[PDB]
Design a binder for this molecule. Structure first.
Ligand code: CDL
Ligand code: PC1
Ligand code: 3PE
Ligand code: 3PE
Ligand code: 3PE
Ligand code: LMT
Ligand code: LMT
Ligand code: LMT
Ligand code: SF4
Lengths: 155, 70, 174, 82, 70, 115, 318
């Protein structure tokens, strides 16, 4: 049966991608400090297979951890475009989510989703390190639900 | 705990043990149960080539003893 | 086909020479010299000189590493030239390959060839020695003799290398 | 006195170079003082890489042996005891 | 009041000079640093097993909003 | 043969891994994705512009020193000579001249990088 | 039967490399008061498999400005040469028994540098170029001292054959009569393998990713597999050189176990060192080798030429 095979192959690639999520070493403001605390020993994001890598060419996730200003917006879009696919964006904190405390500023982008597509929105100012980890595990369960091969089979 | 690092080390150790064990056993299988003949110098190659002719079966590792001298 | 191993490697030897002799960007010229140095090591090794072959390869790998560094510093342009990018480079490159290909084609066809001078194409093995059975490498004995017979060679080479350091310091002290 | 004053200074500032020169000096010096150096050349001579071509016995070579196990010819008793 | 963090003169007696030569050549202070990371290898890690375990919080924690009733 | 077979197998294994890497994944190529990386902003000037080498003199000295080891690597074989008086003298002579050349370049500030 | 032997060498190499990545992350983790991968498979045992599958289904990118052929060639050279380094290794029997195995390993190590130089240059990006030129400096720093360190050791072994080192060390490890050289050799292998504190050609905190910054997915994986294969191979080389395992011809597997344990611990030491020290500055690496190791290495080379002659203990040529 073709369906059974592509169903199992979807599980394999979905498992491999969520089990090995490499965020780009990309932080913007206060929220990056809680992101640092997710890598710290108490939460040890490495133990889920989550490893920071500096190069966008070697990153699977962009965690927008902090305010995105207008001056920074073209750079964030640049490094997002330079990530190979599949790629995911996690929006962390009120600033990234929708402008937050600086929503009405002349120099702030009112939400990073004006610039890049966003898979998960982590609320808080900042979200606790555990709240960000909950957001990453939520991203994993989203990847687990993907049906690329199943949809390809029925094209 | 630190001993939870051991399982990955053991897997790494078994994988690194395989090439040495495999090479040693394939040499015995391919050389009639003995070590592969080592010929670093022309003299050693000469004798090995002479053993190939002497074997009568074109194998330098098939040995002939007293039973071959009448 | 394996009996023609030295010939095949020597064909690649020339191809590497045509590579850097057509003079593309020195980055690619260095690549062509590495290939030639690699197969050149293979040619000499097949004549019984394992130490000579590996040594020339080792030296030329170190030399081309320096050339690479100097190239990015002192011999680079905005658009470094590959063999296809330049008409003069391509013409020399093609001319070299065609001269090479025709020498190969005719030497194989006739088992001989006249390219200015006469070369026999029976295969290179025919000239080899037929009786070896010593307990040593003759190349290793000859090279090691540099320290017992080559006292004079040791002195002039050692002195030249020391003077070489003194000289390059002088030459590059503006 | 200056022998120790200079040496102490380099020991404090560049012990790596002090060790280098001391080791190099021993390499140059000890071979001429060692009583075992003479055996290095004897062992190299006693190593038979070549066949020992026999001599045509012409009737007056008392110092040469007729058989490998004859008392004449060099011996390696010194080598077994080394 | 103030203190100096780095204003000390090394002693020049032969024992101290040799102690420093051994440090420079035998890498004693680099070996010492290896000891510290080794001690950490055998310490229990501080990691909690999220989501089965949770970081501690207090009654004042400010999280998701809610409207209450009588 | 064994040697050529081993080299061919290794470099063929590497080539197959690259072939799979390029033909198996789904691709989506556009200009911004393939643009050169420089931390989010476009590069200023070509990466082919000259890159000054501050250790150029050590690099040339490496060539001379790298040939010395070609002269020294035969020493294990040279030690089997019967003429050990000459061999030991010439071996030490060569290494000392290497040390003298190093000491000269050191004292003349050849090992300091240009600033 | 030789083709089977080749596969029984390189399939295990790549599997050992994959699980060395897991071991490093766990060892670093516990040294850092955390755990490291323990979710993907029991004790993280499936984590290397997940990463490998992830990368090879990731989209590979050819940069717009890159030199296409050289961009592809470099990772192929890196892994190909890394696997070639293993063929003369006696464990206890080499796959290929070479008269000049040590010289072969030196030559192949030099050739592997060009996979760094060409990948960085072919990327046509500034961080990649800076990384590649750091590899030029690194090679200039260690290569001369590395060869002369080996020479001094081989003056006791008597040959360039790797299997002779087993015979040389049948009574005693060479680490005893040559621990100063072992010290300098061990550091040189860290520089040779681009390992911390000499991780300069990648230098993440400085160059983002250095020579491989433009590489993604499978092509990037080839560079990772190459480096980690070289780390294991260089510690096997260190074990053979200095910690010779006794070889019983009738029980060759006892040699393999003892030798494998030694090589593992030496590899663990590389990870341990990475956890402990800050990074060198790449000009300070060059001064370390030329101003400290080289003067000492030259002196010790003189000593190890003279010592066999003066003690009448020159090894056999054969
Ligand atoms: C295993 C081998 C691994 C390397 C695989 C290389 C091919 C990879 C496929 C590829 O090139 O990408 C697509 C690439 C085309 O992509 P593109 O972006 O449209 O155009 C790329 C550039 O136009 C042209 O690309 P370029 O800018 O890189 O330059 C082309 C080429 C220059 O090509 C030439 O001008 C003549 C051919 C060069 C190769 C001949 C050797 C050069 C002389 C040395 C002698 C060595 C003998 C062996 O440059 C080279 O120097 C080739 C080096 C090959 C080294 C082989 C090792 C020896 O090539 C094609 O398939 C066509
Ligand atoms: C050490 C080496 C490690 C190697 C690891 C190897 C990975 C092992 C696991 C393989 C899982 C199966 C592959 C699935 C991943 C495919 C990537 C993907 O997600 O594409 C989604 C795409 C989705 O396409 P789509 O049609 O649904 O939509 C994409 C188009 N737009 C953008 C418009 C929507 O799937 C496919 O297109 C085809 C899926 C086929 C799955 C079977 C793969 C066959 C392999 C042959 C490929 C031909 C080239 C030869 C390569 C060598 C063969 C081995
Ligand atoms: C009978 C006569 C006998 C004659 C022969 C006698 C010979 C023995 C006596 C000679 C001295 C022996 C010691 C020689 C070892 C090499 C010493 C050395 O080179 O260290 C110096 C080097 C530079 O140190 P630094 O302070 O920065 O600079 C000095 C001032 N310019 O310092 C460094 O190298 C710093 C290195 C930094 C990187 C270190 C990272 C790893 C550290 C942990 C490794 C532990 C060692 C394990 C070895 C394993 C071996 C398998
Ligand atoms: C720029 C892009 C570069 C890409 C890299 C491509 C891969 C190239 C890899 C390196 C190529 C050079 C290989 C040189 C091998 C030298 C190894 C060696 O010396 O031993 C091999 C063997 C000699 O054995 P030996 O012990 O010395 O004496 C015989 C005793 N029975 O002798 C043999 O086994 C026979 C070997 C003859 C054929 C050699 C062919 C080499 C030609 C280069 C390819
Ligand atoms: C201070 C920190 C320094 C950090 C730098 C890293 C150094 C780590 C070095 C790791 C290697 C150390 C040696 C490992 C011992 C392994 C023991 C073993 O498995 O073999 C048993 C061995 C005796 O057996 P064997 O080697 O064959 O005897 C020698 C005769 N040829 O053993 C005999 O008991
Ligand atoms: C990157 C490009 C590299 C280009 C490399 C170019 C290599 C040069 C090609 C050399 C080809 C040599 O070709 C070789 O010629 C001889 C001719 O006697 C053939 O040898 C032949 O000898 C006998 C004659 O009695 C025939 O019966 C036999 O069938 C045939 O093998 C070899 O089978 C062939 O392999
Ligand atoms: C910048 C220029 C620097 C030039 C430096 C030159 C340094 C040379 C130092 C001398 C080196 C050799 O030193 C010399 O070695 C030979 C043998 O090896 C020794 O000779 C000793 O052993 C040999 C055999 O091995 C015997 O033939 C001899 O009877 C015995 O005395 C000498 O006793 C020793 O004096
Ligand atoms: C036979 C081989 C073994 C013998 C050793 C051979 C190598 C000798 C190396 C050079 C020795 C003299 O040459 C060298 O001169 C320079 C002067 O600029 C000194 O160097 C001086 O500045 C440099 C850089 O700051 C440092 O090494 C040191 O702080 C200081 O001494 C060296 O301390 C001295 O070693
Ligand atoms: S959301 Fe809050 S914590 Fe995060 S960057 Fe903005 S102000 Fe700082």
């Amino acid at each position: 049966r073709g369906e059974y095979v592509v169903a199992k192959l979807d599980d394999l690639i979905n498992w491999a991608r969520r089990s090995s999520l490499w965020p780009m070493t990309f932080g913007l403001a206060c929220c990056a400090v809680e992101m640092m605390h997710m890598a710290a020993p108490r939460y040890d994001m490495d133990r889920f297979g989550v490893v920071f890598r500096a190069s966008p060419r070697q990153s699977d996730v962009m965690i927008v951890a902090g305010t995105l200003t207008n001056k920074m917006a073209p750079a964030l879009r640049k490094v997002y475009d330079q990530m190979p696919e599949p790629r995911y964006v996690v929006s962390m904190g009120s600033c990234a989510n929708g402008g937050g405390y600086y929503h009405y500023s002349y120099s702030v982008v009112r939400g990073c989703d004006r610039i890049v597509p966003v898979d998960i929105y982590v609320p808080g100012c900042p979200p606790t390190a555990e709240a960000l980890l909950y957001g990453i595990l939520q991203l994993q369960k989203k990847i687990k639900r993907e049906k690329r091969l199943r949809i390809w089979y029925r094209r | 705990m630190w001993f939870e690092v051991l399982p990955g080390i053991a897997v790494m150790g078994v994988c690194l043990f395989i090439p040495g064990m495999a090479t040693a056993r394939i040499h015995r299988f391919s050389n009639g149960g003995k070590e592969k003949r080592v010929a670093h110098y022309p003299y050693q190659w000469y004798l090995m080539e002479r053993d190939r002719r002497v074997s009568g079966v074109n194998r330098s590792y098939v040995s002939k003893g007293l039973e071959n001298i009448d | 086909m394996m009996l023609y191993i030295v010939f095949i490697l020597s064909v690649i030897f020339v191809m590497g020479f045509v590579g850097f002799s057509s003079k593309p960007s020195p980055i690619y010229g260095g690549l062509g010299l590495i290939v030639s140095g690699g197969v050149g090591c293979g040619i000499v090794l097949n004549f019984g000189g394992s130490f000579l072959g590996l040594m020339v390869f080792l030296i030329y790998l170190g030399g081309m590493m320096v050339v690479f560094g100097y190239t990015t510093a002192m011999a680079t342009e905005q658009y470094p030239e590959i063999w296809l990018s330049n008409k003069a480079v391509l013409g020399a490159f093609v001319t070299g390959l065609l001269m090479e290909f025709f020498m190969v084609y005719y030497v194989l066809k006739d088992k001989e060839v006249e390219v200015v001078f006469e070369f026999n194409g029976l295969g290179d093995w025919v000239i080899y020695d037929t009786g070896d059975s010593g307990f040593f490498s003759e190349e290793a004995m000859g090279i090691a003799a540099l320290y017992s017979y080559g006292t004079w060679l040791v002195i002039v080479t050692g002195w030249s290398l020391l003077i070489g350091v003194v000289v390059i310091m002088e030459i590059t002290r503006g | 006195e200056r022998v120790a004053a200079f040496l102490k200074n380099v020991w404090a500032k560049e012990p790596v170079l002090v060790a280098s020169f001391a080791i190099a000096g021993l390499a140059v010096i000890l071979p001429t003082l060692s009583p075992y150096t003479k055996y290095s050349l004897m062992i190299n001579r006693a190593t038979p890489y070549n066949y020992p071509v026999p001599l045509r016995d012409d009737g007056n070579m008392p110092d040469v042996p007729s058989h490998p196990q004859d008392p004449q010819g060099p011996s390696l008793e010194w080598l077994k005891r080394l | 009041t103030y203190k100096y963090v780095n204003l000390r003169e090394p002693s020049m007696d032969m024992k101290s000079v040799t102690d420093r030569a051994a440090q420079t050549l035998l890498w004693t202070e680099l070996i010492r640093g290896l000891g510290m990371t080794l001690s950490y290898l055998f310490r229990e890690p501080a990691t909690i097993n999220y989501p089965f375990e949770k970081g501690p919080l207090s009654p004042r924690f400010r999280g998701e909003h809610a409207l209450r009733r009588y | 043969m064994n040697l050529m077979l081993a080299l061919l197998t290794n470099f063929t294994l590497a080539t197959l891994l690259v072939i799979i890497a390029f033909w198996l994944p789904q691709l989506n190529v556009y200009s911004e994705k393939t643009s050169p990386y420089e931390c989010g902003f476009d590069p200023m000037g070509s990466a082919r512009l000259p890159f000054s080498m501050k250790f150029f003199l050590v690099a040339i000295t490496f060539l001379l020193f790298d040939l010395e080891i070609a002269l020294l690597l035969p020493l294990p074989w040279a030690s089997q000579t019967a003429n050990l008086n000459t061999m030991l003298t010439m071996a030490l002579f060569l290494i000392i001249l290497l040390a003298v050349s190093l000491a000269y370049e050191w004292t003349q500030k050849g090992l300091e990088w240009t600033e | 039967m030789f083709m089977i032997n080749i596969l029984m060498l390189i399939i295990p190499i790549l599997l050992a490399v994959a699980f060395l990545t897991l071991v490093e992350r766990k060892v670093l983790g516990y040294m850092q008061l955390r755990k490291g991968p323990n979710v993907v498979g029991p004790y993280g045992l499936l984590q290397p498999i997940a990463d490998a599958i992830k990368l090879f289904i990731k989209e590979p990118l050819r940069p717009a400005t890159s030199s296409a052929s050289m961009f592809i060639l470099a990772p192929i050279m890196a892994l190909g040469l890394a696997l070639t380094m293993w063929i003369p290794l006696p464990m206890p029997y080499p796959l290929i028994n070479m008269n000049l195995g040590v010289l072969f390993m030196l030559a192949m190590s030099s050739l592997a540098v060009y996979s760094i130089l060409w990948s960085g240059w072919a990327s046509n990006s500034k961080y990649a170029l800076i990384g590649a030129l750091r590899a030029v400096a690194q090679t200039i720093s260690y290569e001369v001292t590395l060869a002369i360190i080996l020479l001094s050791v081989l003056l006791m072994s008597g040959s360039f054959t790797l299997s002779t080192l087993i015979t040389t060390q049948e009574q005693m490890w060479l680490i005893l009569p040559a621990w100063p050289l072992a010290m300098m050799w061990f550091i040189s292998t860290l520089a040779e393998t681009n390992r911390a504190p000499f991780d300069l050609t990648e230098g993440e905190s400085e160059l983002v990713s250095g020579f491989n910054v433009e590489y993604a997915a499978g092509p990037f994986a080839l560079f990772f597999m190459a480096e980690y294969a070289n780390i294991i191979m260089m510690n096997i080389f260190t074990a053979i050189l200095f910690l010779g395992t006794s070889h019983n011809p009738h029980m060759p597997e006892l040699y393999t176990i003892n030798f494998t344990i030694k090589s593992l611990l030496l590899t663990m030491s590389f990870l341990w060192i990475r956890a402990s020290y800050p990074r060198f500055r790449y000009d300070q690496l060059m001064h370390l080798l030329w101003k400290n190791f080289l003067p000492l290495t030259l002196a010790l080379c003189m000593w190890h030429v003279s010592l066999p002659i003066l003690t009448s203990g020159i090894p056999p040529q054969t």
